[PDB]
Amino acid sequence: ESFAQLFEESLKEIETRPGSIVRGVVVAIDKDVVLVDAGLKSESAIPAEQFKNAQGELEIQVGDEVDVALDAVEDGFGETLLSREKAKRHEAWITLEKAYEDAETVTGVINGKVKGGFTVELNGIRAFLPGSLVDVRPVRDTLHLEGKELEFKVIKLDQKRNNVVVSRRAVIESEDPWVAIAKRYPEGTKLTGRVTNLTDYGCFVEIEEGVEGLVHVSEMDWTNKNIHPSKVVNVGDVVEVMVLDIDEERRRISLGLKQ
Amino acid sequence: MRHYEIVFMVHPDQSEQVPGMIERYTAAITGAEGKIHRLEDWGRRQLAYPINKLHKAHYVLMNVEAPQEVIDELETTFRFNDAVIRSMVMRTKHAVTEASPMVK
Amino acid sequence: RKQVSDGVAHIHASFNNTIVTITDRQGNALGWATAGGSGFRGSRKSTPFAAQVAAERCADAVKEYGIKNLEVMVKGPGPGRESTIRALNAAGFRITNITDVTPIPHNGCRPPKKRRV
Amino acid sequence: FCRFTAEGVQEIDYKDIATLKNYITESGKIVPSRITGTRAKYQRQLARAIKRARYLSLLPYTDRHQ
Amino acid sequence: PVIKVRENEPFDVALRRFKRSCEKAGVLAEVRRREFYEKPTTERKRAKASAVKRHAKKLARENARRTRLY
Amino acid sequence: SLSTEATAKIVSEFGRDANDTGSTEVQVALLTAQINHLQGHFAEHKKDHHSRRGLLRMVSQRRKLLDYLKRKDVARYTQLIERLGLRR
RNA sequence: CUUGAGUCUCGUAGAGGGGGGUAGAAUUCCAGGUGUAGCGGUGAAAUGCGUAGAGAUCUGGAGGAAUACCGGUGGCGAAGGCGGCCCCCUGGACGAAGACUGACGCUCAGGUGCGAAAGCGUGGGGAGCAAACAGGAUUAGAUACCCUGGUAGUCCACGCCGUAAACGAUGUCGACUUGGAGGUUGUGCCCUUGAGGCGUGGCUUCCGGAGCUAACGCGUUAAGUCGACCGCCUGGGGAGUAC
Numbered sequence: 001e002s003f004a005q006l007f008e009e010s011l012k013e014i015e016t017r018p019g020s021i022v023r024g025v026v027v028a029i030d031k032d033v034v035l036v037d038a039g040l041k042s043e044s045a046i047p048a049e050q051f052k053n054a055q056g057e058l059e060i061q062v063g064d065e066v067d068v069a070l071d072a073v074e075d076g077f078g079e080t081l082l083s084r085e086k087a088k089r090h091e092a093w094i095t096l097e098k099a100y101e102d103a104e105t106v107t108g109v110i111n112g113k114v115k116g117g118f119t120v121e122l123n124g125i126r127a128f129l130p131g132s133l134v135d136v137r138p139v140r141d142t143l144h145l146e147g148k149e150l151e152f153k154v155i156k157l158d159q160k161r162n163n164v165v166v167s168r169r170a171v172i173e174s175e176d177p178w179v180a181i182a183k184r185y186p187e188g189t190k191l192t193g194r195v196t197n198l199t200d201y202g203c204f205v206e207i208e209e210g211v212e213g214l215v216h217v218s219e220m221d222w223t224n225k226n227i228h229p230s231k232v233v234n235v236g237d238v239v240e241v242m243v244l245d246i247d248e249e250r251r252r253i254s255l256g257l258k259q
Numbered sequence: 260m261r262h263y264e265i266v267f268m269v270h271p272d273q274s275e276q277v278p279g280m281i282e283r284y285t286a287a288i289t290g291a292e293g294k295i296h297r298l299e300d301w302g303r304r305q306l307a308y309p310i311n312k313l314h315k316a317h318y319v320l321m322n323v324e325a326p327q328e329v330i331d332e333l334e335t336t337f338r339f340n341d342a343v344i345r346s347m348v349m350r351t352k353h354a355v356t357e358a359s360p361m362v363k
Numbered sequence: 364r365k366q367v368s369d370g371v372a373h374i375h376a377s378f379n380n381t382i383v384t385i386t387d388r389q390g391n392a393l394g395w396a397t398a399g400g401s402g403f404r405g406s407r408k409s410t411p412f413a414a415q416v417a418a419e420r421c422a423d424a425v426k427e428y429g430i431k432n433l434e435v436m437v438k439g440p441g442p443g444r445e446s447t448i449r450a451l452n453a454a455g456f457r458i459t460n461i462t463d464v465t466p467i468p469h470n471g472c473r474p475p476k477k478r479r480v
Numbered sequence: 481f482c483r484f485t486a487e488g489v490q491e492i493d494y495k496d497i498a499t500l501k502n503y504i505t506e507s508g509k510i511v512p513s514r515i516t517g518t519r520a521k522y523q524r525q526l527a528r529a530i531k532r533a534r535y536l537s538l539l540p541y542t543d544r545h546q
Numbered sequence: 547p548v549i550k551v552r553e554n555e556p557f558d559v560a561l562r563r564f565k566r567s568c569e570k571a572g573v574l575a576e577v578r579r580r581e582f583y584e585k586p587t588t589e590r591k592r593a594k595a596s597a598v599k600r601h602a603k604k605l606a607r608e609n610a611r612r613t614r615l616y
Numbered sequence: 617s618l619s620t621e622a623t624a625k626i627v628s629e630f631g632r633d634a635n636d637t638g639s640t641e642v643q644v645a646l647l648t649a650q651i652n653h654l655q656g657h658f659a660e661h662k663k664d665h666h667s668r669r670g671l672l673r674m675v676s677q678r679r680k681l682l683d684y685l686k687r688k689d690v691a692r693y694t695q696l697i698e699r700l701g702l703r704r
Numbered sequence: 705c706u707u708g709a710g711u712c713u714c715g716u717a718g719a720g721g722g723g724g725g726u727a728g729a730a731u732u733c734c735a736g737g738u739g740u741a742g743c744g745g746u747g748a749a750a751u752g753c754g755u756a757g758a759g760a761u762c763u764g765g766a767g768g769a770a771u772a773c774c775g776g777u778g779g780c781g782a783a784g785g786c787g788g789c790c791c792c793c794u795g796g797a798c799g800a801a802g803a804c805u806g807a808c809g810c811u812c813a814g815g816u817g818c819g820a821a822a823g824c825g826u827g828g829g830g831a832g833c834a835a836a837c838a839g840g841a842u843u844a845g846a847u848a849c850c851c852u853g854g855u856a857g858u859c860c861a862c863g864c865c866g867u868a869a870a871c872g873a874u875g876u877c878g879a880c881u882u883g884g885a886g887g888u889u890g891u892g893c894c895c896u897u898g899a900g901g902c903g904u905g906g907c908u909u910c911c912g913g914a915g916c917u918a919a920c921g922c923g924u925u926a927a928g929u930c931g932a933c934c935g936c937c938u939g940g941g942g943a944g945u946a947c
Contacts, residue, residue, distance in 0.1 A: 076612050175483025176899095178502050178516075210481060210899090249505045250570060251515050263791095266536060307533075307540040308728080316537070320495075327792075334791080338725090345727090347536060349790065360496040375760060379745065382760055390762025391738040397759085400742065405749080440577045445561065452557045461564040463547035464544060465573050468580070468730035469772040469788080472832040473858090477582040479849055480747090481899055488896095507547060507571050509773035517899095520778070520888070521717075527774040528789085534728075535789055541728050542773095543548050576772075580730095583833075597777045601910065605885085617794085620713085627712070631804090637712040638805035646711070657722090657793060665818060666721035666781075670795035672817080677710080684808040 015039055019069035019086030026064045034060075036068065042079040044068055050084035054124045082236070091125065095164065098154060103174055108152025108166045110134045110141060114190030115242060117165035120152045128192040130156045133165020136173045144169065158183075161209025163191075177210045181248040184208060188259070190242040198229045203257075205241050211253055215241060219258035233257075260293070260326045262354055267337060267346040268310075269317040271303055276342060277317055284321065284333060293325030296354045299362050310344055322355055367393070369432040369459075372421070374447050381414035381443030383421040383451075385430065394424035398443065414443020415450035422454035434460040484522040492525040494532035500539060504530060508542040547571050618650050630699075640685050641696050647678040648700050 015021060015038075024036025024044065034046035051066070053059050060066070068083035098104030110118030110129070118134025118141060120127055133155025134141060141148060152166025153173065160176070167173075184191060193207035202216045218224060221232050233239065245254040269277050277300065288295050301318035310316070323330075330348060337346040367387050375382040384395040398413035401420055407413055433456035435448055452458055484492065494500070503511050503518070503526055510530050513523040533539035547567040551560045568574065584592075618626075626649055628634045630642040654671045658664065682702070685693040697704070 175486065175502075179498075245566070247506065247570060248502065249511050251511075252570075254566075268536070306537040308537055308545055310537055310727095318536075330791085334725090345536065347532070347726095347790065349532075360493065360498075371761090373761060377744095380743080382743085384739090384760050386738075386761055389738090392761050393739080395740075395760060397742070399744095405746075440574050445565065448561060452561075458557060458560065459551055461549050461551070461560060462544075463564075463568055463571070463573055465577055466730055467573065467576055467772065468770085469541075469728070471729065471770055471772085472731045472768095473770075473834095474580055474583045474731095475833065477584070483899095486896095486899060503774095505571075505773075506567070507773085509571075510775095512774075513776080520776080523774075523776095524718095524779095530774080531727095531789055535726085545729070572773095580772090594777055597909095601777080605911075623712075633804080635712095636804050638710075638803085640711095640805065640808075643711050643805075654794080661722045661793070664722035664794065667793090667795045668721090669782080669818080670721095673795090680808070681710085688808085 011039070017070040019067040019081075019083055019089065022065045022067045024065065024068055024083075026060055026062055029058075029062065036066070036083075038068060038080075040070075040079040041074075042077065044080040044082075045078060046080075046082065050082045087125075091122065094122075095154075095157075104154065105151045108150055108168050109147050110152075110166070110168050111147050112142075114192070114240070115184065116189065117156075117163075118168065119192075120164070120166040120168075122152070126192070127162070127164050127166075128190075129163060129165020131165070132156065134168055136167055136170040139169060141168055158209065161207065161211075163208070177208075178248055178251060181211075181246055181253075184243055185246050188242050188244065190240065190259070191255070192238050193241050193255075194236060194238045195234060196236070198233075198235065200228070200230075203229045203233060205239060205255060205257075207238075212251060213241065213243075213253050213255040215255045215257045219256045222258065260324065261330075262296075262322070262324045262351045263330055263348055264351045264355070265321045265323060265333070265346065265348045267319055267321075268344045269319065269342050270344055271313065271315045271317055273342040274303060274317045277319065280340075280342065281319060281321070284336075287329060287333065288323050288325050291326050291329045293323060293329055294354075295321065295323050296356045297322045297358065299359055301359075301361065313344075316344060320359060322351070324354060364427055366427075366429040368430065370425075370428075370430050370434075372418075372433055372435045372451055372456075373464075374418075374435060374437045374443065376414065376437065376439045376441030376443045376447065378409060378441055380408050381417050381441060381447060383414075383418045383447060385421055385425045385428075385433075388434075393428050393430075394421055396420035396424060409442065411442040411446035414441070414447045417443070418447040418450035419454055422451060422456070430456060432457050432459050434458075434462065436462045436464045438464045438466070440465070481517040482519040482522060484526075485519055489522075492522065492529045494529040494536070494538070496529075497533060497538050500526070500530055500533055504539060506543065508540050547573065618646065618653065622649070630696075640681055641692065644678055644681045644685070644696060645700060647674050647681070648702070650674055651678070 015023070021038070024038035024040075026034060026036055027043070028035050032048045034048060034051055035043045036046060037043050046068075048058065051058060051060055066083045067086050069081040069085050072081055073079070094106070095104060106122055108120040108122065110120045112118060113131050113134065114128055116131035117129040118131070120129055120134070133152075136153065148168065150168040150171075152164075152168065153170070155165045155167055157164040191208060193205040193213065195203050195205040197204050202214045203220070204212070205215055206212045217227060217229055220229055221227050239257065240259070241255045241257055242259055243253055244256040244259075245252075247253070269280070281298070281300070285295055285298070297320070299320040301320060303315055304318050305315055306313075334346065334348055337343050370385055370387045370393065373384045373386060375384070381398045382395065383397070384392055386392045396417045396419075398408040398410075398417045401408075401413060401416045403410070403413040403416075433451065435451065435458060437444055437448070448458070448461065492499075503516060505511060510527050513520065516523075518526060530539060534541050547564065547570075549560070549564050549567060551557075623646065626645050627637050627642055630645045631637060631639050636642065651671065651674060654667075654674075658668060658671065661667070682693065682697075682704070685696065696702075
């Protein structure tokens with residue numbers, strides 16, 4: 001009756017758009033496709049690679065619940081964007097938690113700087129930070145035992161584009177993209193960027209707060225022309241890339257991957 | 260009457276003459292009960308390209324609510340005056356009293 | 364002749380023939396060479412190789428001036444564009460600036476009519 | 481992803497040279513609305529501003545000219 | 547496309563950079579375009595035709611894609 | 617176009633209520649004034665054809681209005697044409 | 705009487721029109737410097753320009769014409785058409801609310817006006833381009849295509865001409881009939897918590913349903929379902945010609 005109308009606004013009230021409410025129960029597993037049902041119009045074709053943790057093998061059997069993401073509806077048939085990004089929000093929440101007590105503590109282990117800041121990895125994910133953040137002083141973890149255990153003390157974060165440089169060792173110590181496009185500029189600043197869509201000439205890795213990068217086909221590997229970028233890297237994956245070129249005018253930052 | 264916005268560029272050797280010129284311009288405006296809402300000596304400035312062989316010039320901004328006859332007169336004066344290299348009298352909807360972004 | 368350390372190389376690259384002209388920084392030409400002059404005619408002189416050899420010839424010609432530094436100004440569309448500069452480099456000048464100086468009108472004169480072939 | 485919609489500007493200013501400089505080429509040319517992602521209404525205004533600037537020698541018409 | 551060779555920069559790299567700059571400019575293309583007079587009508591026709599082609603590529607092909615090849 | 621103040625003045629004079637504005641007579645007056653204004657312009661600018669089209673249209677409209685007035689109420693029309701000095 | 709039609713208020717976007725200024729790039733020519741044998745052109749050549757110093761290159765000057773980028777199945781205009789920037793004069797469109805007028809409307813034979821390009825007249829101008837013309841090729845020939853030159857003309861003023869595949873090959877005005885993806889330009893609300901969310905108007909591009917259609921296709925911008933008015937067709941040629 002209005003039973004159904006009320007039930008509709010009820011079901012509106014008991015779901016939201018992003019990957020927030022851990023609701024999809026894994027109702028069939030087959031390599032290489034997981035699939036859930038979070039109270040959406042259809043079931044997700046999940047990769048297996050959004051769900052294996054830190055050494056390669058699966059972690060969740062039938063009935064298990066992770067939220068995914070949304071705001072994109074129907075490409076022909078199907079429903080979602082991946083739950084792994086979901087996870088990013090959780091990471092953001094832990095990073096935010098720092099603010100409360102002015103100190104987020106986990107483990108951060110940063111061996112080296114792709115682009116001037118040691119890389120820190122938290123749980124499954126690994127992030128890149130600006131060069132200062134790795135060390136509190138001028139200590140430098142190059143003399144430290146390799147891939148050492150500390151935590152991360154945050155030095156610097158870019159707040160829009162996601163780059164976070166964190167503080168290893170020293171426990172005792174405690175319009176918008178395009179005007180100032182000189183931060184990752186200078187010749188070869190390495191970046192960690194998720195690829196988006198590979199347009200048979202390109203790969204379109206673009207992460208640093210509303211920009212566009214290409215890594216088109218010529219570098220990508222150490223073979224030139226026979227490569228076909230879909231075979232050689234991925235879809236949706238955070239990779240090794242650096243700038244090699246910026247035009248701040250005809251917004252074409254032309255990144256590379258052969259480095 | 261009509262809110263104009265004027266920017267004229269003086270030859271850099273006549274930079275010491277500029278204030279007098281400005282005063283004169285103001286006076287004329289005042290004469291016909293015309294208001295002058297902002298007035299900004301930008302000073303000596305490097306040109307993006309060398310107009311009439313010279314590389315710097317002295318820019319003056321000036322916003323005026325005046326009758327069009329006086330504007331015309333001003334334009335005429337500018338054209339004949341050899342100190343002022345370029346001018347650009349340019350209509351505007353409102354008074355726009357707040358300062359320019361290059362002054363700030 | 365007065366020796367000069369730094370100068371310009373003007374590379375006039377047409378569809379039919381490349382012309383390389385080495386000059387001082389002020390404008391006064393020191394030497395020049397062409398693909399047509401280098402012993403290439405018609406099909407041959409409208410090629411990168413021809414351009415390169417012209418460039419080489421030009422370089423040879425301005426040996427007595429003792430030019431070390433060189434800025435290149437590349438004009439027009441042609442094969443003799445990249446090749447010529449490479450040749451120049453090989454010949455052994457420190458290439459300082461590489462400028463493009465193609466005359467692009469801002470819609471000015473009417474071009475000649477389109478060929479019917 | 482237009483800047484002027486977000487800022488919410490009433491009119492683009494030719495005097496605001498820095499802003500203009502983001503939308504102009506290394507060669508001096510005005511950058512397309514595909515690349516910048518500027519809104520159409522604003523784009524025209526921006527272009528006009530640039531033109532004005534060029535007249536006032538605030539921006540250059542081109543890189544080569546002198 | 548004005549360029550200056552950086553300190554301890556290779557020649558080849560510089561050349562490449564220059565080429566890239568040129569490409570960006572679209573100077574060669576421009577030159578090609580202005581070689582001969584294009585009648586206004588012709589210009590119009592090309593533009594519209596090109597647009598049409600683009601549209602065809604975008605939508606029809608997308609529709610095709612939905613269905614598998616084998 | 618006709619300046620706001622002028623328009624207002626016109627309305628006040630011819631319009632009975634002064635808030636009315638849409639009275640036939642008032643409308644006619646407005647048209648007439650505009651036409652008069654444009655005469656000066658068109659003496660100067662004889663090749664301004666596009667602009668003249670608008671003027672022509674306005675004239676036509678005025679004529680129509682006059683015609684309408686005539687059938688409805690003759691005396692009023694007569695008065696109007698005395699005021700404005702319209703030959704017909 | 706107020707639903708059609710119009711008037712008033714405030715805004716909005718616009719290559720809409722007319723007039724007058726100005727800017728920068730590029731071509732051409734002139735004067736001079738540097739410099740030395742080629743340049744130019746093509747499928748390949750030659751005519752042509754060059755040692756009387758060309759081409760290249762730099763400096764200065766003259767003058768005309770057009771406005772790169774922006775720039776878009778973008779915008780404006782009744783159509784023709786309209787594109788750097790600035791000012792003056794000026795026409796239309798749309799939206800927001802109200803207020804007013806009170807059928808004042810629609811269509812239109814004759815009539816009147818506007819009407820690309822070429823063309824004509826008189827007077828200016830003349831850089832580039834280029835009918836005609838000349839030479840060089842090509843060819844069996846080449847009164848063409850290609851090359852080198854090149855005059856009317858293109859440009860401005862004021863007149864005339866009154867036609868174009870002047871095309872959406874689709875008269876104008878009004879009403880009604882499933883949808884989707886855009887673009888552009890308003891405007892109301894909403895925590896603009898952000899580039900957004902939900903509407904509501906105008907103009908516009910593409911796809912497609914019913915229906916229609918000889919089919920192709922059209923499809924809320926109809927070529928569907930209807931009404932009002934006008935224009936026009938009656939086998940091909942002869943002929944849009946003769947008188």
